[PDB]
C-alpha cells in the first residue's frame, strides 16, 4: 500500500494529535490496503526546523507546522503571528476562508508544497514565573518563541528577550531557566507539563496558534487520481472535526492546569489587556512590507 508518514511535533491528546489520528482512522477505513497512515507524535521522527527537510525529500508525506514557523520559505504567513490582529477564532476563521486566505495554502508553490487545509489550535496565552498583568510585568524577562521574527518583535516591544526555541525543547528550556516564559494555547501548557515550571499564565488571547496542513506536490499530484480524491476529500473532513472540537479541547486543559493545583491562572480586565495590545500591536508596521498591506487590510475585514 500506498505509505503517508504524518509526523508533528505535539502530544496526542491535542488538536492536531486527534486530528492526525482521525485521519489515519478514516483513510485506512475508506482505502483499505491501499493506504496506510502512520502518525508520528511528539517530534519522535521529526522535530521543528528538520520537518520541511524530511518532507521535501520524501521522509514524511504530510506535515502541520504552525503558520508561525514558514517565514523562510514564504513571507505572507507571517500575517497570522501579529499580535491581536484578529478580534476573535471566527475572524482568523473568515480570513482562512476567504479568496485571499485559500491562495496562501499554495504559497509555497515553488518549494513543491501542496497547502491541504488549515487547522485550529487556539489563542496564546502568556505565562511566567511572575504575575504578568501589565506589559511593564514582562520587562527583562526571557521569553520562548516559535521560529518567528515577528514573535520576536513581539517580545522586543515589551522589553522583554525572546529566544528561538523547538517545540520539544520548551519545557527544559523553561526549567533551566535558559528562558523564565513564553505563550502556548493552553493544550500545548497541559500536555508538555508546563504548567509544572510556570506558576502564572494569563488568560490573554494575544495571537493565533495554527497550523497549515501540507504535503509534497510531488508526491501528491502523483497519487492515482481515484486515491487522491478520497485522500482529499477525507482530510476536509479531518479539518471540520479539528476546528469545531479545538476550543473544547483547550477549555478541558485549561480546567485539567486548574486541577493539577501548581499555578494561578490570571485574568487581564478590558483595560489590562488594551495595555499590552497598545504595546505589542504596533510591530505590524515592520513587516507590512513583507506580507502585504492590502492583505493585513483583508484581515481586518475579517474582524467583521
Ligand atoms: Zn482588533
Ligand atoms: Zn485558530
Ligand atoms: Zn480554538
Ligand atoms: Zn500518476
Known amino acids: 500500500p500506498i505509505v503517508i508518514k504524518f509526523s508533528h511535533v505535539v502530544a496526542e491528546h491535542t488538536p492536531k494529535g486527534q486530528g492526525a489520528l482521525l485521519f489515519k482512522k478514516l483513510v485506512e477505513e475508506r482505502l483499505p ?10 517530534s519522535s521522527l521529526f522535530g521543528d526546523g528538520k520537518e520541511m527537510e524530511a518532507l521535501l525529500l520524501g521522509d514524511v508525506q504530510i506535515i502541520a507546522p504552525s503558520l508561525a514557523k514558514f517565514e523562510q520559505y514564504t513571507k505572507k504567513l507571517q500575517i497570522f503571528d501579529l499580535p491581536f490582529l484578529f478580534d476573535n477564532i471566527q475572524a482568523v476563521d473568515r480570513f ?24 485550529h489550535n487556539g489563542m496564546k496565552q502568556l505565562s511566567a514565573n511572575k504575575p504578568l498583568r501589565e506589559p511593564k510585568d514582562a520587562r527583562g524577562l526571557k521569553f520562548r518563541v516559535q521560529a518567528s521574527k515577528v514573535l520576536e518583535e513581539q517580545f522586543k516591544a515589551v522589553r522583554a528577550n525572546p ?58 499530484n502523483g497519487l492515482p487520481e481515484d486515491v487522491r480524491g478520497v485522500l482529499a476529500k477525507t ?13 473544547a479541547l483547550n477549555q478541558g486543559d485549561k480546567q485539567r492546569i486548574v486541577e493539577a493545583k501548581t499555578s494561578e491562572i490570571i485574568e487581564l480586565t478590558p483595560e489590562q489587556r488594551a495595555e499590552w495590545r497598545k504595546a505589542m500591536q504596533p ?22
Do not use: C
Open 96 to 119: 482562512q476562508q476567504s479568496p485571499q486566505g485559500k491562495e496562501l495554502l499554495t504559497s509555497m508553490q515553488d518549494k513543491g508544497i501542496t497547502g491541504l487545509g488549515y487547522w
Open 33 to 42: 490496503g491501499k493506504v496506510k497512515v502512520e502518525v508520528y507524535p511528539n
Open 235 to 247: 482530510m476536509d473532513e479531518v479539518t471540520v472535526e479539528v476546528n469545531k472540537q479545538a476550543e
Open 163 to 220: 529566544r528561538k526555541m523547538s517545540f520539544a525543547e520548551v519545557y527544559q528550556g523553561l526549567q533551566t531557566g535558559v528562558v523564565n516564559g513564553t505563550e502556548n494555547p493552553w493544550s500545548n501548557i497541559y500536555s508538555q507539563k508546563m504548567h509544572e515550571v510556570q506558576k502564572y499564565i494569563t488568560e490573554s488571547d494575544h495571537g493565533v496558534l495554527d497550523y497549515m496542513v501540507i504535503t509534497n506536490t510531488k508526491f501528491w
Open 283 to 304: 510591530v505590524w508596521k515592520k513587516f507590512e512590507g513583507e506580507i502585504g498591506a492590502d492583505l493585513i487590510k483583508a484581515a481586518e475585514a475579517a474582524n467583521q
